[PDB]
Design a protein around this ligand. Sequence first.
Ligand SMILES: CC1=C(/C=C/C(C)=C/C=C/C(C)=C\C=C\C=C(C)\C=C\C=C(C)\C=C\C2=C(C)CCCC2(C)C)C(C)(C)CCC1
Ligand SMILES: CC1=C(C/C=C(\C)CCC[C@H](C)CCC[C@@H](C)CCCC(C)C)C(=O)c2ccccc2C1=O
Ligand code: SF4
Ligand code: SF4
Lengths: 75, 80, 30, 138, 98, 728, 164
Amino acid sequence: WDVYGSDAPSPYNSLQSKFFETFAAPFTKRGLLLKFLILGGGSLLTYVSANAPQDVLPITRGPQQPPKLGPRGKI
Amino acid sequence: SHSVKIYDTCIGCTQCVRACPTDVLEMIPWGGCKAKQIASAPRTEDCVGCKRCESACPTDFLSVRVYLWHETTRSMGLAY
Amino acid sequence: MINLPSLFVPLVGLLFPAVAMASLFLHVEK
Amino acid sequence: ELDPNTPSPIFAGSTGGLLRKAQVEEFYVITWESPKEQIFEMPTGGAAIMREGPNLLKLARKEQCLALGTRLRSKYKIKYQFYRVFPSGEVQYLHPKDGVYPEKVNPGRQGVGLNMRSIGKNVSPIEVKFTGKQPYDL
Amino acid sequence: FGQLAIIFLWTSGNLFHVAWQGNFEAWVQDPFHVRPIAHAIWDPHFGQPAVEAFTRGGALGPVNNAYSGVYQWWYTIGLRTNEDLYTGAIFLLFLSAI
Amino acid sequence: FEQWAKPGHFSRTIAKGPDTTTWIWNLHADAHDFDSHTSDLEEISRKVFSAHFGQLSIIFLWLSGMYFHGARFSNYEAWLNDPTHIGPSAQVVWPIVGQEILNGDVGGGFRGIQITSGFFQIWRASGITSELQLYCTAIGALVFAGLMLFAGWFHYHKAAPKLAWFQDVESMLNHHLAGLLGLGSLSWAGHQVHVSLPINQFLNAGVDPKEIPLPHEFILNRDLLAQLYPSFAEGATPFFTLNWSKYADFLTFRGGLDPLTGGLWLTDIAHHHLAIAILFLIAGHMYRTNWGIGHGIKDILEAHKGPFTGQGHKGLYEILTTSWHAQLSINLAMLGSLTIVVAQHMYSMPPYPYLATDYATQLSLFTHHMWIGGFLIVGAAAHAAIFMVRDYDPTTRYNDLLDRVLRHRDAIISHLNWVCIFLGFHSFGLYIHNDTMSALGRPQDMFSDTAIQLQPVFAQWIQNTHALAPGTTAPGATASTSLTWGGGDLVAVGNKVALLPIPLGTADFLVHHIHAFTIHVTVLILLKGVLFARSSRLIPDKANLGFRFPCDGPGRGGTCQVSAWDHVFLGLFWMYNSISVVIFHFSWKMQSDVWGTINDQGVVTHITAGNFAQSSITINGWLRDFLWAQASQVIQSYGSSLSAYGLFFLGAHFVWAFSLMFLFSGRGYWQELIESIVWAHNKLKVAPATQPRALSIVQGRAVGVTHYLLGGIATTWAFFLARIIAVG
Amino acid sequence: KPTYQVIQPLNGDPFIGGLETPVTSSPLIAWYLSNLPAYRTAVNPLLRGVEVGLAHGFLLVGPFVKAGPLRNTEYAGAAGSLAAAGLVVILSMCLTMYGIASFKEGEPSIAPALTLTGRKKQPDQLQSADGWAKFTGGFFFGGVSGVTWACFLMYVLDLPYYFK
Ligand SMILES: CC1=C(/C=C/C(C)=C/C=C/C(C)=C\C=C\C=C(C)\C=C\C=C(C)\C=C\C2=C(C)CCCC2(C)C)C(C)(C)CCC1
Ligand SMILES: CC1=C(C/C=C(\C)CCC[C@H](C)CCC[C@@H](C)CCCC(C)C)C(=O)c2ccccc2C1=O
Ligand code: SF4
Ligand code: SF4
């Protein structure tokens, strides 16, 4: 008799109120504690990817091909 | 929040200020001109530099402009 | 120890203004 | 699904006037009696079937109104009315609060009518240096 | 005042800046070519041809070609010893906080 | 009768017991137009084909020049004979102050300015031949203007003429098809077969000069054409009943093009112009008229409905019948690409003999023939406006398909608005990268061909298939439908190249997506301002200011450029940015990567390099190598005959320039001014009485529009020109 | 079954211009817009958008490799989720600087009562501060893992989308 529907569309999502939740979590969040992981957040890669050699570059060394920083003249 | 200042003489209309969009229009009775009429705004809070208010409104020297500074969601127009 | 001063540039461009457009985000909600 | 609503006003569904987020910071309504279903031009576009009531229909820029009161000036028609209407209802209206027709002039209508400068005398206006109490304004 | 501050930290730097960077204490040995030397350019987008880029003047890094004149306006007043710079820095700091 | 002015005309308040200058461009800026006239058709229908008149009498007044100033001083003869090397010329100029050198002296025994745009190639196409000849057609068409301009006086004047049988619309829409196309198409075939075909086929070698078979022949008696492509020419034409097969000989779908000089076959143009000829003769009877055969006028359209899209597309207008304005977008957008269609078509696959190889008109032409098109469409639907704010009456519509839009505004426009970021914003925002990635960006890895490649590729597409298309699949025709597409099946002629497999790739799904872009955010400007225009969701009531109408409120905190008239006032600029782009892409394909020369060991040699491919990826590459790599042509180019293109874009750059002064400027600022000076005249009593006021707002969003928009055109035609010819 | 709500707009009063058509509300499975946080009125953050995070992270394994810098290269086929975590953590701020269009300081929440709750007026302001921000604990927790889970596992492709 009820032409249904949805309307009420499919099972109210999985027995999953737990672990993700709560656990871990960076969480509680904002106002105070946000910076708390956007301070590392932005001084992380940064900071440590404002170094690490020696090395990794695009690569080039020992200025020669008809010498250089000369000629020739001296060392 | 409507500006700045705007000035005397006309009304009646039948050939002047008959067309603010957002109202802002009474007409008191008051004594001076050739039957009785002095005006700007029984209001100015619905308007809106609808500044079509002198185009229809003569009488000599600046006569309508805007100055909204604050400039208001009442008459900066933007509803949605 | 040594190699840098990059320390600065990932700031002055990367986090610093990340914090400008952050805390005066604002000026409004300063 | 369906009803309350008894408009007319009528044309159905499109965007181009009165939306979602201004059931708050204002709203505005409009009343009249409708000569015929006598169809006319009505903002978002349509053409509205006027009806045998109404005349109450929603619309946020009260801008839109008088326009429409007078919109009702090119088929012959007459007596526009509007109102407000908001959370939680109240004002906000010149026709009728008394329908004083902005034109006319009649009863007691107030001051707020003009500079001690009957303009000509206009110049550098330095009666100001940090006015307080002193003018804020006039 | 206020900005008098930064005008003064306009240069306590860029003074401080050079002798680091560039090569005056070097350029003393011979005074005329040149590619007058600005700052040191930490631009992590520049393709390995940073050599082929700006391995210029005294460099060792893709440095800017200074044109601010000044490098003479400082040579004139006195110094060519950047160990006798380090100081105009510290001075336009002796004017900055002050 | 009548007439004549004098003050006052049509802008109701024109006379005004004057008071001020600035009426002399309210009139010059109303004058034609209507409603500031009347839709009272019994005096407006009887203006439009009044017309519509002169324009022709002007077009005649035109063409009757372009043969007198062909055939009074040929390069036509003194060349024709020899296409190839030695080329065009239609004007030579009086010896005033150093005009001279402007008429070159480089055309085969001829002093004179060289000429771009076929014509030589248009009239070596038919045949004609002999100056005393299409000079015998200079007179054919000049009075022949006369009578057509003797139609102004024909009707209207002594004859206030008829809307009753103007309104209707069936005889004419049938007859144009039949009637006055159909006097044509095929009655150019009788010409294109007998006149044209062989005075070309036998041109195609021998027949050098003067003994030139004055068309005079080949009527009543055959034998000669008969001695040529046969057909058996007794007095009995087979295909009266299906000997068709025979009177053929010389018209099987030949496609490709005449390798003994490009063009493409006239043996391939009666079959094209008696079929597409007669559809238009027959199919130009399908509607009512009197004799009970025909269709709905509109009675067809409301024929069909659809649920949403409701009523359908129903009861299709009744001013669409009546008059112009309502109609007036469609005959333009249409006619619109109907000058971008013929364009991307002409160069694209050559008509009249001597193009493919040419240049200075397998380009030139190509453009203009795309301005007019762009121009035309990108100002076609400023007729959708007016109309609503105008010719549209009371009612006819609601539930019309029309209204179904005006409701569904805001959320039709809108979902373009975004494409018009993505499509562009970031797909142009895309040369940019590869600049930041060629300067900064080390070939290492970025967006070009041996780059953001894209290996085979980009295909091909199709086209290519366009090259298996004639060997089967559409059985025959001949040679690959247009060499431009296909595989490597490759020709040309005249030492230099003609058309070849012009292969695309990266540099190709680039650029493009800009015309692909642009013609998005160049419409919707357009649509935004075509829909809202009369009802705009933000001054809601427009028909309360007119068509133009400046802006309005300093209120609502900044209401300007609201009018479609001013939605059109920049409707254009971009076109120019878009037509005056696109031309560009073209002229660095044709060339650099299509035009040629010849030498030999397998090696065609282009005007410029197979550069392009990877030095027109990056935005820049078009000033590195599209300016200062070019312009040299015009930059130096004085004391010569490039001595106009070194003389135009000069006073074309200024007059791109002397736009902004009127267009960036204020308007009150200027009026405010024209006192001050005033004191000089007046006090010293001179001064007008047409009180010299300072140019009306719209009027100066009616100059930095024209002027900008004269400016960066000539310029580029002062320019692109002189490139071509000597490195041309 | 008998035709449907066509022409006559958006439910209610033929003048509330959101709009109704399919791709509003429909058989062909509007159903979507109703089990990811979409519509419903629903329930309780985390287990709504720890789904976004979970999903949203790896969604970028794309324009983080052939696009950008190094296509395929050294250091290397760490592609999938590089700093791709790294260049979240603001996407993981941003909406934790949003907290201005949501305010309260606590989450009951959660059931509902009888009575009803999610009380008969939702479309709008139920959600809060310490009322939304734990969805933010999701997407981020979910982002990473949403990133990281695409790394550890797989990288010479397979049949994952075939459709679906
Ligand atoms: C003072 C004086 C004078 C002077 C003058 C002058 C010096 C001028 C110049 C000016 C400038 C400084 C500039 C201008 C130029 C011009 C132009 C520029 C024109 C134009 C045009 C046209 C008409 C065209 C058209 C076209 C087309 C068709 C399309 C394509 C392109 C073209 C352009 C070709 C005079 C003599 C008057 C008189 C006396 C005194
Ligand atoms: C200059 C300028 C004017 C003033 C320009 C005017 C009034 C045009 C001048 C019209 C002509 C040239 C009259 C000048 C005299 C000529 C008719 C002929 C005499 C000169 C010789 C040829 C003999 C504006 O009105 C304006 C409006 C809005 C934005 C910008 C501007 C703007 O920049
Ligand atoms: S504003 Fe208009 S109606 Fe009022 S006094 Fe002046 S002219 Fe009269
Ligand atoms: S700003 Fe002008 S048009 Fe608007 S309400 Fe006020 S007086 Fe009327």
